[PDB]
Structures are given as C-alpha cells and as structure tokens.
Design a protein around this ligand. Structure first.
Ligand SMILES: [Ca+2]
Ligand SMILES: [Ca+2]
Ligand SMILES: [Ca+2]
Ligand SMILES: [Ca+2]
Ligand SMILES: [Ca+2]
Lengths: 208, 209
C-alpha cells in the first residue's frame, strides 16, 4: 500500500494524488507539521532532507518526479512503447522546469517578480500547446492516446497557473480544452471537489 | 540509432550521456553549435524548450538531458533489474540533477560571490550519495543494484566536475572516492576520458570551473 508523507499543502504532491485518485488507488496521508519539521529529526532521516516521502510497501522514495515515474511505471501510465516513454519524460521534465520557476516566484520573490513572471508565462506555456497540437489535434492526452503521469503533472501545473494568472490559457485553446477535459474525468473531478483537496492551500506560505 | 548529439562545444549537460554512449560501445555524431549560430536564433526557436542539447535517435528527436539519459537507459538496459530498482535509479538521478542545477547556478550567475557558501555546503550535498553506496553491497558495485545505470554516468560526471571545483571534496567519502576510480577505470570509459574529444572541451561555456 501507499503512504504520502508531506506538509499540509498541495504543492509537489498534488499531481501524484490526482494520479492515485483518478486511477482508483487507495493511499494513506501522513501530515508533517511545520513544527515537527523544525525539530529536525524527520528532515535528517530524509535522503535529500526534503519531503515528499512516499512508501510503496517497504520501498521508500523521495523526489516528487521519482514518485510520479514509479506510479507511471507500475500503473501503466508511461506510454505504449519506448518512443512514447521518452516523449512522456520530455514533457514531464519541461513541467518540472516551469514548476521550479513557479516555486522560486512563490517562495523567494512573489512581490517584485509576479509581473515579470506573468509576462514571461505565455512563452513558457507555448511548448505544451505545441505538443498537444502535434498529437491528434490536442483532443486526447499530452503523449499518445492514453493518460500518462506527465498528464497529471501538466494538469496540476496548469491549474495552479490559472490561480496565479486568471485567463492565462485564453491564449492557448488546446491547453484550455485539455484542462476542462481531464478535470471532468469522474474520479478526478470528485477528488478535486473534495475537502481533502480543496481545504489544503496550494503552497505553504499561503501565496498563490 | 543512429545517434546525433546537438550541443555547444562544452562538456556541460552532455558529458554524462557521452560517457554512457562511449562506455556502452555506441557510436554517435556530434553536431557542434557555435555562439554565432545560437545567437542567430533559428536553431533556438526550433528547440522545444529553447534549449540544447537536442538528441536524435533515428527518427526520434529529444530535448532535456535527463530525458536523453532515461531514453538511453531504457533502450540499452541501464535502468535497474526491475521496477523497484528503476525507482531507485530515478531517485539517484533526480538527486544528481538537483545538485547539478545548483552547480550551474553558481557557475553562470554567482561564481565570485557564491563560491565560499557553495563549497561550505558541498559535504552535506555529497553525503547522500555516500550513504546510498553504503547501503548497496557496501559500495562495491554501482549506485543502484548490481549493474551500471544511466544514474551512474550522471553521478560520475557530477563527482568529477566537483573535484575540479573543490579539490579534495571526496576525501572524507571513501565509497564515493573508490567509486570514481573504479568506474573511471572501465576500459571504454577510461579511453574516452583520456581522449581529446573529452579533455579539450571546457566543462562550462563561460570558462569557469
Ligand atoms: Ca495505460
Ligand atoms: Ca530541465
Ligand atoms: Ca477566459
Ligand atoms: Ca544492463
Ligand atoms: Ca528536485
């Protein structure tokens, strides 16, 4: 069974939770208070001193993208073949890059950086619109014709950017329609509407 | 195959995948991109994320160095023996990428002011890899399991460039030290590391190391 060990935020666990919910998998949440984290003991035991920590039976993993790839591999959300698997990675790596820029903004430079960030945003989102346009006219998934862990990550990234810069997908019809389509998947829709998702802040510092 | 690496004339983010290809007896073409070519803008606008490396494997075109590493890992069987090991391989590689990102940020943006703080923090950043080795066959084999993975090549490069940045940074870490020596001695890799193709490239594009 699966355990997610994280702070009481959506953050870097939002995509992997969406994945698990949408795939109908059961899991446990272990919540780490800022104070438990400050004590230092748990942090010292984490491979790279960070959360999330994830348990799959006796397998303990760190790094949100390691967890996504693991779930992608085990649950068959990693493309139909080797070529698609590579494209799934290429998408997820691009999502991670933009996520890192988003995190940097939220944590270190929200006030002085937001305008610079939002104006730079369309150029950062365009590659995903491009990928969609080259795959069945953008009517299905980011890679190929079945959902992948990259879809869940990309979906999260887009949802949080809509909160940051409302209407930012107006310039991107395929990304816009993709957000609506994936968000409407019944198990995912239910999860996104649920107190367990809605009552967590996006980020620890309460900015979004 | 065939394989083509499209990149600046630097080691940088292609060093690990080149070591991987060389050690695995694979052949590849280098397409070198000069400053003039990159500044012209055409190549850059054609890249998915506006970045190099670009990698060609037959009709497949890839961007993102870790995507290229994972692809070569997948297709060449350098990804652990099973799913549990593959997850550990990813965990190592994501850790390597995190420190590489920090290394690049120093080199490119903050070398003069930031070097002291970086080298001071370095031991705490390397210790996880020593720990991983200690928990896998007493550090006598690879970073994960009993066979080489793309993570080994990436970690090896990370360690090598760090020894340039902070000579002696592995002295306190016997497993990491022995690992660098052991992997660096693999005959095809040893030959590649000794070759002008590797030796005569700068680590980074701005001449800092
Ligand atoms: Ca599937
Ligand atoms: Ca990247
Ligand atoms: Ca609108
Ligand atoms: Ca093998
Ligand atoms: Ca990371």
């Amino acid at each position: 069974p699966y355990t997610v060990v994280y702070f009481p935020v959506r953050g870097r666990c939002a995509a992997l939770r969406m994945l698990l919910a949408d795939q109908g998998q059961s899991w446990k949440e272990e919540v780490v208070t800022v104070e438990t984290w400050q004590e230092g003991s748990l942090k010292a035991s984490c491979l790279y001193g960070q959360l999330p920590k994830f348990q799959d039976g006796d397998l303990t993993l760190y790094q949100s993208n390691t967890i996504l790839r693991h779930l992608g591999r085990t649950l068959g959300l990693y493309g139909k073949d080797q070529q698609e698997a590579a494209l799934v990675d290429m998408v997820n790596d691009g999502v991670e890059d933009l996520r890192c820029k988003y995190i940097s903004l939220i944590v270190t430079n929200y006030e002085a950086g937001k305008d610079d960030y939002v104006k730079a945003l369309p150029g950062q989102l365009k590659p995903f619109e491009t990928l969609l346009s080259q795959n069945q006219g953008g009517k299905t998934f980011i890679v190929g014709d079945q959902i992948s862990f990259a879809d869940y990550n990309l979906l999260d990234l887009l949802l949080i950017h809509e909160v940051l810069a409302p209407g930012c997908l107006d310039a991107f019809p395929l990304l816009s329609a993709y957000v609506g389509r994936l968000s409407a998947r019944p198990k995912l829709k239910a999860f996104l509407a649920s107190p367990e998702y809605v009552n967590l802040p996006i980020n620890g510092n309460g900015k979004q």
